[PDB]
Design a protein around this nucleic acid. Structure first.
Ligand SMILES: [Ca+2]
Ligand SMILES: [Ca+2]
Ligand SMILES: [Ca+2]
Ligand SMILES: [Ca+2]
Ligand SMILES: [Zn+2]
Lengths: 154, 75, 71, 155
DNA sequence: CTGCAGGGTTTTTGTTCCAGTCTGTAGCACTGTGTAAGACAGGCCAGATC
DNA sequence: GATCTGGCCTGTCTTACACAGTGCTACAGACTGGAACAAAAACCCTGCAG
């Protein structure tokens, strides 16, 4: 929430710990291990019936959006760099997040729990735009650091 | 070339006289000058009327022993 | 009148530096076991100045700049 | 007391009133000319100093001996610009390393080929010898080239 | 009554080796692979000359 | 219209300048258990001291 970079974090961490006799923040490695429970590809799930032509695996994370582009030079090149998620897994992440809120909301509405297990419906918004010719540092020559199109949902 | 001439002709004289060379390395200022690089990015004002003033302030602040001592904090 | 620059009064800089090291200088005087009340008028502090530039900075008058420091 | 050390050469010259940087007078300490520093290389007394540099500049300006241009350069040992900032007579520690590094780099680039067998090689041979030098420095030691050599590349 | 050299005490304080197990921190790779001024030697050539 | 020359070109040589800082990760560096140790710290306690 404050762009704070790892080197910084470790520095100020050692600083405050050796400063006043206590462990106020947590060190990196453990913070990150704890983090691994928030990115996509950490929760089990199921799908009934099974998805159509979608890998049954569930534990994957940050994938490459080329989608196995046969790198053979002759054909259209495969230099375009991209990163994305198995959409379904991104969903199950965001939903497992908002779990807390949906449970408290079932508590306000007083609706039963062993009877609200099925009839649910989530509405999904999406959007996609691109940023022009982004500026960056140490790029006097082109490293295609200009265009980016960020496809997203909420 | 120059430095070659210095080191093959003039090292012993100064090393004899002024205690130590390399002790007076210019290395510090140039090497550290990348701080002037980063400070301009992060903590700028920004307007060159002030850009210097606040950069210099942050720099000298980062430079005194006192805060470095408090940064060590019992090793 | 076309230059942007900032600086100190050199002397004020030096006195800041020395009054800053006050702790370490007193600690060292204690370490050398010398008297601390008398023999307090004859210290000699040697301090090196230095100056080098910084070229072609993407400015937000040319791009380069010169920095002047001491230690 | 003040010790003025931390300057690269160019600055020292331009602020001691010399002729930067590769002209006849080279030693910021000894009055030796360029070429004579090749046959002899060791015994060279340190002379360059601030007060006498002011004196030599005054001798240049007045020219009390009414000499011609180049004898005037010589008798003053070529001190034309009036120095303004004091200097302590010594050299940086880093750029000695840097110049030595680039000189050894070039001497390797040259000893790859044959220069005492071929006295005046051409430019393309220099590019190729550099290329095979980079191949040798990369295959072993796992070292990549740069535009200009910082301290770490030198070390 | 005084001065010290050296008994005892119990107390640190360290002392030994082999399994960890956490850690910070010093490795990894990773862009780019060309510039700027100024001095000097030699060829040489515009150009006045007699 | 040759002649010689000041000066201008070009090629080469020397000193300068950006290349951090950012995530991953492995390693060595730190922590412990019984045995047993020696080495000093400080009171108490005694002698050999006048
Ligand atoms: Ca748009
Ligand atoms: Ca837009
Ligand atoms: Ca420098
Ligand atoms: Ca530099
Ligand atoms: Zn010399």
């Amino acid at each position: 929430n404050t762009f704070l970079s790892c080197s910084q974090y470790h520095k100020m961490y050692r600083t405050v710990k050796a400063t006043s006799g206590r462990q106020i923040f947590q060190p990196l490695h453990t913070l990150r291990n704890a983090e691994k429970e928030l990115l996509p590809g950490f929760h089990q799930f199921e799908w009934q019936p099974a998805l159509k032509n979608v890998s049954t695996s569930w534990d994957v994370g940050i994938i490459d959006g080329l989608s196995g582009w046969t790198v053979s030079v002759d054909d259209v090149p495969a230099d375009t760099i991209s990163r994305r998620f198995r959409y379904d897994v991104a969903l199950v992440s965001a939903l497992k997040d908002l779990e807390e809120d949906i449970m408290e909301g079932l508590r306000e509405r007083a609706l039963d729990d062993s009877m609200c297990t099925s009839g649910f419906t989530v509405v999904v918004k999406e959007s996609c735009d691109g940023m022009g010719d982004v500026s960056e540092k140490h790029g006097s020559g082109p490293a295609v650091p200009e265009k980016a199109v960020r496809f997203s949902f909420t | 070339t120059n430095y070659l001439h210095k080191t093959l002709a003039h090292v012993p004289e100064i090393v004899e006289r002024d205690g130590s060379i390399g002790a007076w390395a210019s290395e510090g200022n140039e090497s550290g000058n990348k701080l002037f690089r980063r400070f301009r990015k992060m903590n700028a004002r920004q307007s060159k009327t002030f850009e210097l003033e606040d950069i210099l302030k942050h720099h000298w602040l980062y430079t005194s022993k006192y805060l470095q001592k408090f940064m060590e904090a019992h090793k | 009148a076309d230059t942007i620059s900032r600086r100190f009064r050199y002397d004020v800089a030096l006195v800041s530096a020395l009054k800053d090291l006050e702790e370490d200088i007193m600690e060292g005087l204690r370490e050398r076991a010398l008297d601390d009340s008398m023999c307090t008028s004859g210290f000699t502090v040697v301090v090196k100045e230095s100056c080098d530039g910084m070229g072609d900075v993407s400015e937000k008058v040319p791009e380069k700049a010169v920095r002047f420091s001491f230690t | 007391f003040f010790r003025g050390t931390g300057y690269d050469e160019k600055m020292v010259r331009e602020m001691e009133g010399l002729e930067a940087s590769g002209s006849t007078y080279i030693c910021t300490l000894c009055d030796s000319t360029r070429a004579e520093a090749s046959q002899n290389m060791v015994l060279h007394s340190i002379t360059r100093s601030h007060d006498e540099n002011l004196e030599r500049y005054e001798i240049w300006r007045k020219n009390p001996f009414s000499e011609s241009a180049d004898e005037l350069r010589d008798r003053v040992k070529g001190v034309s610009a009036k120095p303004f900032m004091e200097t302590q007579p010594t050299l940086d520690a880093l750029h000695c390393d840097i110049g030595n590094a680039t000189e050894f780099y070039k001497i390797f680039q040259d000893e790859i080929g044959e220069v005492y067998q071929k006295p005046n090689p051409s430019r393309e041979e220099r590019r190729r010898w550099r290329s095979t030098l980079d191949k040798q420095l990369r295959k072993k030691m796992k070292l990549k080239p740069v535009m200009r050599m910082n301290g770490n590349y030198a070390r």
